[PDB]
Amino acid sequence: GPALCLFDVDGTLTAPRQKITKEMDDFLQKLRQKIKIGVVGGSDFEKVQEQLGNDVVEKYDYVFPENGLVAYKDGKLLCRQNIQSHLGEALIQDLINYCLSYIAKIKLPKKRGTFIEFRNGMLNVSPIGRSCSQEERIEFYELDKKENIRQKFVADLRKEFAGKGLTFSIGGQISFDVFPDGWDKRYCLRHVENDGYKTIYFFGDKTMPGGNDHEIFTDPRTMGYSVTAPEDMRRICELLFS
Amino acid sequence: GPALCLFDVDGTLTAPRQKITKEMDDFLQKLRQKIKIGVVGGSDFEKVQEQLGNDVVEKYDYVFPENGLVAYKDGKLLCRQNIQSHLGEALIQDLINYCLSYIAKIKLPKKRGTFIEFRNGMLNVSPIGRSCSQEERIEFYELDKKENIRQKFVADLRKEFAGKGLTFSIGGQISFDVFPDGWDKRYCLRHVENDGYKTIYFFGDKTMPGGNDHEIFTDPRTMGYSVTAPEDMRRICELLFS
Ligand SMILES: O=P([O-])(O)O[C@H]1O[C@H](COP(=O)(O)O)[C@@H](O)[C@H](O)[C@H]1O
Ligand SMILES: [Cl-]
Ligand SMILES: [Mg+2]
Ligand SMILES: [Mg+2]
Ligand SMILES: [Mg+2]
Ligand SMILES: [Mg+2]
Ligand code: NA
Ligand code: NA
Ligand code: NA
């Protein structure tokens, strides 16, 4: 029946960290004549626009930056949630208060600023501070491997906030993310489920346990496909839809 | 003897929140044929470039972004300074640690992110977090006026650290600044007081207490002139230098 293809962006439609190629851009627009298409990424709208184009909300039937915490359908923004409204101010403050006190007790070479970055769909927590310089970021990343600073911090937060409906995830070099359970890429499915699609396909390059496509891939609402590269994505689409 | 004119940038060489005009820029290059000129501002070099032109270091004999913590003379970097280098990483971290722990204990209706904004010349500290919305800023300031949150916080910091040569200044609705003693616009006077000037003129538009030109205006090493607008600065320069 009527169906939808949901694509991870980075590593799936694009080489890691790159803009999409015009060839792949043309392929997806031809695919879209047979089936609706949508993209989902953890990065913010501006990054999605850089990777896929400023006119992204016109070229894709759905656009889900920030895992869908910002969501466009048919070019218009859908209803929105944020972490503080979902969790309540009291839990937000307890989480922040705890993280602030914990960071105060970490011994580091350097500390700077923006220890807590408050985003739509998460708190990003950095022991050094997100305002650090590139040199300081690498110094921290290197010490963190040696001392397990972020790993211990997250293990402590998981016990302290057991039962409160939070997920913690270390990514990148200086930080970890604290977000409501289920606000990974599965969040966007709320905007497409039970909306007439007989099948919702999903394509992603990090569907393994621990990868950022694992939960949406394994969700029963999607017919999930693991891709190894954008050329593998195109291969599967030509098989299924041509 | 030989003299130097030092100008505030915003509101003195430019209309507030506006770029320098071509006509003013021409005026200063003519004035520079008669007397050395310099600019000092609170903003970083990139912002000074936005206000005065990317070639700013070529158009003035001295350029002092960040109150002189960055100093250019005759087109080349004379000196760079920042709070972490001056205070040392140990003291930086003790200050930040104390503020993080303290903020973790403040009871507020809301907390957000960027409790500590690290700048080259100061730490900007906010119990609620600088990322909060304008509505949240107003709510906080109402509570602060009745609970004296920022006053008690600064009082306790003054007891604990000010012997380390630190100043604390409350301002606006949600934050206070922590900075080494004398790191206001006066800081830049160290870079010109050795170059043989008999008079250092200073022109600024916020020369009253509280304003960011007040300390440099009042410093005995400057011949200070308060100006209401760029046109007023120009009228005064006409009478002084023809
Ligand atoms: O590098 P950071 O700490 O600024 O972290 C940045 O990138 C990470 C992912 O990076 P990757 O996919 O390469 O693991 C994200 O988890 C994080 O939210 C973001 O702020
Ligand atoms: Cl912070
Ligand atoms: Mg990917
Ligand atoms: Mg599935
Ligand atoms: Mg001014
Ligand atoms: Mg004076
Ligand atoms: Na961005
Ligand atoms: Na869980
Ligand atoms: Na000196």
Swiss-Prot record, chains A, B:
It is found in: Cytoplasm. NCBIfam families: HAD-SF-IIB. Involved in the synthesis of the GDP-mannose and dolichol-phosphate-mannose required for a number of critical mannosyl transfer reactions. CDD domains: HAD_PMM (cd02585). It is an enzyme of class 5 (isomerase). GO terms for cellular component: cilium; cytosol; microtubule cytoskeleton; neuronal cell body; nucleoplasm. It catalyses: alpha-D-mannose 1-phosphate = D-mannose 6-phosphate. Changing residue 137 to C: In CDG1A; loss of activity. Changing residue 172 to V: In CDG1A; loss of activity. Changing residue 135 to K: In CDG1A; this mutation seems to disrupt a splicing enhancer sequence and thus results in most cases in a protein with exon 5 skipped; slightly reduced activity. Mg(2+) 1 binds at residues 8, 10, 205. This is Phosphomannomutase 2. Mg(2+) 2 binds at residues 217, 219, 222. GO terms for biological process: GDP-D-mannose biosynthetic process from fructose-6-phosphate; GDP-mannose biosynthetic process; GDP-mannose biosynthetic process from mannose; mannose metabolic process; protein glycosylation; protein N-linked glycosylation. GO terms for molecular function: metal ion binding; phosphomannomutase activity. Alpha-D-mannose 1-phosphate binds at residues 17, 119, 130, 137, 175, 177. Homodimer. Changing residue 188 to G: In CDG1A; normal activity but lower affinity for alpha-D-mannose 1-phosphate. The modification N6-acetyllysine is found at residue 145. Pathway: Nucleotide-sugar biosynthesis; GDP-alpha-D-mannose biosynthesis; alpha-D-mannose 1-phosphate from D-fructose 6-phosphate: step 2/2. It is linked to Congenital disorder of glycosylation 1A: A form of congenital disorder of glycosylation, a multisystem disorder caused by a defect in glycoprotein biosynthesis and characterized by under-glycosylated serum glycoproteins. Congenital disorders of glycosylation result in a wide variety of clinical features, such as defects in the nervous system development, psychomotor retardation, dysmorphic features, hypotonia, coagulation disorders, and immunodeficiency.
